[PDB]
């Protein structure tokens, strides 16, 4: 049975929370204005809230950048360790001259926040960076168009870009690894021609750049030829080696795939993706007991695309039966009275009544703050609390964070059923697919709005709303109402599917990236759905398709629809 234990942190009146949020935006602008007196005032008797934690984190990034180390250290002490932003941790550790985190951070080859970038340059300037990892990051920044970060890290390592030693060799290599130079019809020939006087590390990385470019363009033969020249695969960035694996996957080179995965950082090897595809490689070469071991490890990763596929390879069907009772209504009422939970619900309720989308976003921040480090039982009670208050996305937020206690009704909530079901049927698309899409797009937040402007439950772009509305005789502004949004989103699902050879995997990619891009990613042979999905060049769409289809399989099992394994829902994507 679920524990009835609920936290009882001190609560504040609804008026005080509203008054503190009244000044949250000004506190944030005060940080940007470097008005330290203003920020300290806002904070000095804030609640123990996400408002205070958010303002304090942003303040500390500004104090760290401004080297106000006395004030920094006083305020860093008021952050809860779980609530420290990464860049704040970086500034703190640089102030302590502690570069233990730098050994892990330096493994990241892309853009880092300023405090984290400086932490690495400081470690570099003291001798306390792994030199192999450090120069790998330099190259990764060079390939990544982060020339200035690359330059500063080369300089911090004692070999600047203008000093005639290693750093000038690496900078010179931009004629191969540059963003536009890697596209050259001659990139490989130049690399081959200057190959003999390059180090083993510089050569492996450079061949990885050329293979990575080819692999993301879906020129699989060209990519595998270039990746096959990489002598030390540890020198590849995480993106490079994953697109090696993706090239080997798309060409069904199972032995090469398994070898590539074994050269991945152990963290990548343990991801559901490479657990599952390693298992598939093993099973396809007949190493059946090694595959069964890996499928079990993938399946244990939880409620995700590859865990389900791995389960299906083990003969395990998705089972959406809860293994835990519903939360008792009394614990749900008590939970709403915990001071941190109550603060989140106050902001949420009042965002509805006041029509304040920013206030609703802070309600989410308070919710994640209030529930951070709840045990599985409190997480499930909180989930029902959120659901009983209409806070649909935070019910999913809390319910999906458990590992052993599974409430599928709360992980895969289905509000608005009689509406979503009818609009799906009206365009003859699977309502389990539509719910899967909504869950990923908006988490059932009717006023959701992405950075690029995608709107509402189904995250329809305003541009797209204008095409849809003219075709079906709507008003394009119906985009901003729940019913109009669902009608437009469901119609666009159906329409994109029709333009993409009626394939549901293509249509999901095309919903997010546009049908023209989804069509460009098809091969000249048919592809198994999950192979098409895992080799989508846009990381946003690649992650999106897998999550939508995984949600769709859970919803279909929940609704009691005729059983469709996820592997068959992925089907076969047709050749062009
Ligand atoms: C339903 C809809 O409007 N889909 C459009 C999609 O929106 C995507 C945009 C995306 C988005 O907002 N990404 C950023 C999300 S976040 O704020 O970073 O979380 N969400 C929407 C639905 O998947 O963007 C692509 C490309 O523009 C369009 O394809 S195109 O017309 O051929 O150009 C497509 O019409
Ligand atoms: Mg989204
Ligand atoms: Mg990308």
Author numbering: 17 to 592
In the authors' words:
LtgA shares approximately 33% similarity in the C-terminal domain to its soluble periplasmic E. coli counterpart, Slt70, but is predicted to be an outer-membrane lipoprotein that is localized to the septum of N. gonorrhoeae. LtgA is a “heart-shaped” highly alpha-superhelical structure consisting of 37 α-helices.
To evaluate the potential of bulgecin A as a broad-spectrum inhibitor for Lts, we solved the high-resolution crystal structures of the membrane bound Lt (LtgA) from the Neisseria species in complex with bulgecin A. The near atomic resolution structure of the LtgA-bulgecin A complex shows the complete structure of bulgecin A supported by a well-defined solvent model that clearly shows highly conserved residues interacting directly with bulgecin A and those that are engaged via water mediated interactions. Bulgecin A consists of a 4-O-sulfonyl-N-acetylglucosamine moiety that is linked by a β 1-4 glycosidic linkage to a 4-hydroxy-5-(hydroxymethyl)-l-proline that terminates with a taurine (N-linked sulfur) moiety. Bulgecin A is bound in the region of the active site defined as subsite −1, −2, −3, and partially occludes subsite +1. In the active site of LtgA, chitopentaose and bulgecin A have overlapping binding sites. In subsite −2, the GlcNAc residue forms direct hydrogen bonds with the side chains of Y532 and T504 and with the main chain of M501 and Y551. The taurine group of the inhibitor is directly hydrogen bonded to S490 and E580. The OS1 and OS2 of the sulphonated portion of the taurine is directly hydrogen bonded to the main chain and side chain of R491. Bulgecin A appears to mimic the oxocarbonium intermediate step in the predicted mechanism of Lts and is most likely competitive with the glycan strand of the PG.
